Amino acid sequence: MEDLNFRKGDAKTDVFGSDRMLQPSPVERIPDGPTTPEVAYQMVKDETFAQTQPRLNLATFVTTYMDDYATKLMNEAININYIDETEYPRIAVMNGKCINIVANLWNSPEKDTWKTGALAIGSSEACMLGGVAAWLRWRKKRQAQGKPFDKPNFVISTGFQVVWEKFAQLWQIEMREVPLTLEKTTLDPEEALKMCDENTICVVPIQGVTWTGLNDDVEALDKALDAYNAKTGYDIPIHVDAASGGFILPFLYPDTKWDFRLKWVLSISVSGHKFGLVYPGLGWVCWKGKEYLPEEMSFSVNYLGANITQVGLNFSRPAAQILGQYYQFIRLGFQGYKEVQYNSLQIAKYIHGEIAKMAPFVNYSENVVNPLFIWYLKPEYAKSAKWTLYDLQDKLSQHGWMVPAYTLPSKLEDYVVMRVVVRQGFSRDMADMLLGDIKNAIAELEKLDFPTPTRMAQEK
Amino acid sequence: MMEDLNFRKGDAKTDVFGSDRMLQPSPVERIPDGPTTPEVAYQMVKDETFAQTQPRLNLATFVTTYMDDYATKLMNEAININYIDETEYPRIAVMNGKCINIVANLWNSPEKDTWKTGALAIGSSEACMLGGVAAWLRWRKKRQAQGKPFDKPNFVISTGFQVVWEKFAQLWQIEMREVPLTLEKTTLDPEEALKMCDENTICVVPIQGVTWTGLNDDVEALDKALDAYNAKTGYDIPIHVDAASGGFILPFLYPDTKWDFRLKWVLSISVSGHKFGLVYPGLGWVCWKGKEYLPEEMSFSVNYLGANITQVGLNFSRPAAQILGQYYQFIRLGFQGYKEVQYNSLQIAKYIHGEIAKMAPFVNYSENVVNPLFIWYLKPEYAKSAKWTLYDLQDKLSQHGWMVPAYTLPSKLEDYVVMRVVVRQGFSRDMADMLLGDIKNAIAELEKLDFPTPTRMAQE
Amino acid sequence: MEDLNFRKGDAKTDVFGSDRMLQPSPVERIPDGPTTPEVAYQMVKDETFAQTQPRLNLATFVTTYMDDYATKLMNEAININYIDETEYPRIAVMNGKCINIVANLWNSPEKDTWKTGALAIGSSEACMLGGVAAWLRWRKKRQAQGKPFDKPNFVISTGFQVVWEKFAQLWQIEMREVPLTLEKTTLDPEEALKMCDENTICVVPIQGVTWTGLNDDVEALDKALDAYNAKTGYDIPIHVDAASGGFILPFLYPDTKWDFRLKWVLSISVSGHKFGLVYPGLGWVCWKGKEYLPEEMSFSVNYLGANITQVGLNFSRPAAQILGQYYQFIRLGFQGYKEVQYNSLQIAKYIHGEIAKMAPFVNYSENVVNPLFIWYLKPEYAKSAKWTLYDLQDKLSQHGWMVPAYTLPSKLEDYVVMRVVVRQGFSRDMADMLLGDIKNAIAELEKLDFPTPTRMAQEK
Amino acid sequence: EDLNFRKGDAKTDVFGSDRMLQPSPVERIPDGPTTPEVAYQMVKDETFAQTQPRLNLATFVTTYMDDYATKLMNEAININYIDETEYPRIAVMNGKCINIVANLWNSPEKDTWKTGALAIGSSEACMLGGVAAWLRWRKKRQAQGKPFDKPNFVISTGFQVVWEKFAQLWQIEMREVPLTLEKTTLDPEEALKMCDENTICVVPIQGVTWTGLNDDVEALDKALDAYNAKTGYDIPIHVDAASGGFILPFLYPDTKWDFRLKWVLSISVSGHKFGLVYPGLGWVCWKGKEYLPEEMSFSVNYLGANITQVGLNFSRPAAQILGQYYQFIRLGFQGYKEVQYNSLQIAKYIHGEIAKMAPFVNYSENVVNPLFIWYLKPEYAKSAKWTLYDLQDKLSQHGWMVPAYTLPSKLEDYVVMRVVVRQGFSRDMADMLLGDIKNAIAELEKLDFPTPTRMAQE
């Protein structure tokens, strides 16, 4: 009783006894014919094995863990198109309720029950929407005064996230960067105001800088910007890129004035899928009032029912992240968020302290205000050391970690640093595992008799 | 002898619907002060999703509402994979590129590079904007080189455009020139489009699968008409095809229809992977005819997620599950498999199209169904004496869970109230008989009215 | 390679790329051949989409939610046939323990450890067993007295559940109905006694009338019946139809005398699958003592093992509901049930209160004693209104709700009422959603310029 | 240190708690609640010490369905069927099942929606047919001026208990036709001798529970035609086809037993036996609309607009309707034929192997349903120290339930044993059962003294 079609893929075929699993996956062209689901499931699934596991990815800021109930909740929503708001009006309201909670978390003074804000895939779309809003407000203002409005610019630290580089390029807007130095490790207000002019649409301080993990002083900028705006009448506003810190500061630092409590903060953006505790696909942008979102940016659609009004760059998109965000708000509340972020900050502080005790390392800062920090080699140690932080990254890669090594932005580009991000799901126990692996890697690297390639490059 | 004092407060013995929390409203304005149990929070969010249309009964949407069990398992397992971390997850980055290769070859790309030029997108929205910005930037580069001005760009499109092109016009301040629809000209006529083209026209946008009508603009006729215009003027006006729906229908069911990179002036094409690419929401693709048509400005590199990460796109951090799903579909189905599924959707649309024409009040907008969707409206003779409109039929079907949208057509057909049915994968012949039965039952009830409906009165 | 049997249903077949999904489901005859399991699962499952979701069914009294553990427990018992008591003696014992708990909940004075009662599919069979028991007791009595017993009759309010009409027709027993008035909204004893005679087998007061949500005064009926029986010697007993109230009164109204505490209450029936919190398929009937269950009604079986004795109309049946009921008793206890029913009552009271504040509505009763209530249009409002409650029902149906509209029983047949049932799994949050939909629906209906069909019929 | 570990908190281990040192409630509802995991175990653990369903060879009711049907039915656990206004698609699906069943039984009815009703099992299905035959008979006798106060019906002594309930609960006289070795099923002439003007119907059985045989319906229909022509009593047949209703159309299509016969006006079956659905399914069909009394139909006003249905039960689970419709689509005629063929072959195989054993003799040489009975060879039983009750106890020690019982009237001296082969009982499980029996026989033959049941037989 032999099965004639066993290898061709029939009801009796075992996946790894088949002809298809002796053939490579398609690179250029769609295969002419189908295979069984099990076969196709393995061929795709098996390719994802040979890469970093998400919970050991310490490079990313983006959430890699949610509890079983949120995961089930979002998995059940995998086939819900959010933009079909006529079909799914309850999710449209839930989305709006999330926006209100976020805006109230940021101390919005807006009295409308439905606060002014928009859903986003991440900080990318959220930041671009805020910038286009400031651009359109600025163009509208300059026309009324007869001044020209064909050469806009915006000011930001060199520790900017790449999305602002897209914003500059894709909208042909000039980016004016304020460099980083050891004396000024975050955005200095004086240095920023010297680059402001009549064509500056906004200044972008960052809460949770990706390169350094620090917070630009938003209140000091608001203080400096008030005198400058009174002196020139340029009426230059602030937009806060709070991609990380937006869900950290309200709970752990409620008294730090950085948000809509400030006069010149007219809009804020955050990544819900970073420290908003939601799986990838969530960003928020809120405005201080209805008047700061230009009427031009609102749109209406007729062929999904009676009417849908939207702000946003994307249209059709998954709704699962909205369910996840609302779940997180209800499941945790203010206390729950506070305790979870406290854990991430405490664990980040702990690694930060243990890294400082190690002979080759020195921390870029003495204060840890986000669940992330950077460090580099002691300059005295680096001169005689045969390895760089790039080599330490490779050692940790062999145990599954991804701890990224990179050079700092402009004027600190000589500094090779390493960054660790502590997200929810990274415990004290996992930190001890990482610290042991780092110490072991240092001992192995210290036995080298010759410099590594990266160490030789560093000698110019 | 065994009373639980904290039963209602939410402890280990609490029943969700015997607790105080389920006697309280869900938060609208502010985050709750404290937490609840996971089961409580799961219900409060999940229960709000009940009172709306079920996705398989949403005949308004084009976006996939069904995938097989293996793809669903595959994508749910990828819920915590951030695609953009390409240093951490290089295999999905390669898989993404292999998908782009497959799509570009599906569209008959002549590019000889193994890695075709294209980019991942959340949907047709981002894909179209990237294609439009690409056409904008090439045109700017041309006008600068020739000393001509480049401060007043425009693009041409039919009035049956999808809303994303209006966003493109508004958010980039680019002029949209619309070609109206008539009963004589139900799709984009090339001659009328050419009348609106000039030295400042960055591209013309024909649509494959017009959302309003389900028809295809004749791309080749446009390409031929555009070639004569460009030869006379030297304006070098290219085509970008908005193939949101038809992009995954035409290669399989109409392989010889010349509409893609086989045409001289088709320099880029966009499609929604989450419509007839058969993937859950969150997927769009855009391809360019060659490497030279994607401006160097549109490419960017990031330093702090690992070694080097380079990618075109508006979004950054995003879910990766849709990439696994799209690649899964290609292997699982192949060309034959895709062909068979789309054939089913087109046949079922044709069948409903045929049965709708047989009904006394209805007439179909077109005699040819080339996409798995179609529109119809009331017979003018019937409409004069009828007391109801298609809006009333929409509400009747809503009582049985259906969403079949009624709307007025775009410019010059705005007097026509039409109804649209979209046949996606997961919508069978049996489900069509159920909908047709509900329509016939709804007609008989509506014909019993003695007075006109409000919507019927508004019309006259 | 091409797969030749892809559409015929083989190992590579996609459900919605197959010939079967281009064919209608069988209406008249069994299909000649088989299909694949996935195909058959979809063809059946897809038909269930286009109807009310159970949690939005406010018409039903039957449980639509159980916790995850009860559901898992019952699903694991799907293949256990209860009647095989020799094979499954532990469930047979478990069934008897449930009967004991119910009888003690109703203050049974029976001294036997194993109380007298029987399992039922629902209130239907439970009521018929109680009625047939009362019928046979009366037959035995009239034989002893030499009186005739060929013309039996029972008394009940016009607000009876249809099972009593089944009992009357299927057993050819005369039903004598006591009408409802606004002065007498429940079964009045004086008028009820007027229909009693020597041939009355029992009177059936109802706890939780389906039409109104009210409770017949069992104690007042028992008091009048004690005097009547002393004067006539007819020996008329009570059977309480407590389908709903049977699981409400012991927890929320323990001191309301209505059960076996009364002299003439000889049997009681209830729906376990309504407010006993069990999925469909559970009913209980209890007698005050062994002497009130006629020996004729009991039977023994020889072919499933040793000996099996049963009272009941059904034989083979699922056992999961017994496991579910016993689980609920252990999991909740008295406090747990009390807390769940209190939530359901408070939510019903809350909706009841909000409905009274609305301009078109007036409540049938001011006191809510079951998690249900009815209301109708204010008569002054109804005269000038263009819509009826039937029109409101269809409006809510368009959002997925099912809220039933119907005419009341005898002497109130002119009254169109609407009923809302608050079961476990219907939260305060869902009540706000429902109320919002009603307010919005009222605003839509008041915009009518002409009366609806149902409104024209009411002018009679 | 967690102070409330034993009281049931977030850290409590189920079996380190005070509750698991306490008995399950017997008389009264517990005063307070417990955690779900605790309550789940307390209920689940009581179900262990009894027969496993796949080893329960006494029952006729399905103990296995495939994974897709099981998932389909589990997902419908909260759907009350009777709310047809809310769930109109299931009401149609139920009617489509009734049409398929009636056409399976060769209904001559021309109406698209065939005449029939849903039932929890053969119990409710049979009673609905009986009440229908009772009401038709009353209506007939009223028109003729004849009396209608003393009805009776005729059935074999091998009746299933639901007919005794019908007799008792409706006060209708049951006239029983005894079983003999000469007449192993309902003999038609003996049945006719007990009929009179007060006979509402005769009940032949397809799949007798005691014996596994089929009453000859055509012979009854032929004999009843002559009797009805002679008397004008107009006595009809109702077939209790609880088991055979889903066997005969597929494996014996040419056997005339159903609506092809003149006097078969109604048929009932158990969907949860050989209809291949989990417990909770029965069907009754009538030959035409005229044979279902208008009195038996009812309408409700408070669930939706109007709901009309025929049945004893009202609210009930809908999962069995989904399961039945799935089975019709998934298997079809070819699929059903193959499954029942497998069950019959396995029954035939065990029957043959049982005959080869020294102590056993089969009650019949023909196996027409996936079940059969046998008893001890009379010569062997006289000198044997054990009965089939003892063999039942032997097999129970390995988890089997193979029931031993005495036959109905006139064969009450025969202690028999029955094996039912449902879907999910394979050739491999049959070899396992046969091996256990051979081992049990060898153990029992080593007895030196008679068992208690063997002394009672003396």
Automatic annotation (TrEMBL), chain B:
A GO BP entry: L-glutamate catabolic process
Catalytic activity: L-glutamate + H(+) = 4-aminobutanoate + CO2
Name of the protein this chain belongs to: Glutamate decarboxylase
This enzyme's EC code(s): 4.1.1.15
Enzyme class name: lyase
Residues engaged in binding pyridoxal 5'-phosphate: 124-125, 272, 274, 317
The UniProt record lists the keyword Lyase: yes
GO cellular component: a single term: cytosol
Keyword Ribosomal protein carried by entry: no
N6-(pyridoxal phosphate)lysine (covalent) PTM positions: 275
MF annotations from Gene Ontology: glutamate decarboxylase activity; pyridoxal phosphate binding
Keyword annotations of the record: Decarboxylase, Lyase, Pyridoxal phosphate
Essential cofactor(s): pyridoxal 5'-phosphate
Pfam families per UniProt: Pyridoxal_deC (PF00282)
CDD domains named in the record: DOPA_deC_like (cd06450)
Gene3D superfamilies from the UniProt entry: 3.90.1150.160, 4.10.280.50, Type I PLP-dependent aspartate aminotransferase-like (Major domain)
Residues bearing PTM N6-(pyridoxal phosphate)lysine: 275
Domain of life: Bacteria
Family: Belongs to the group II decarboxylase family.
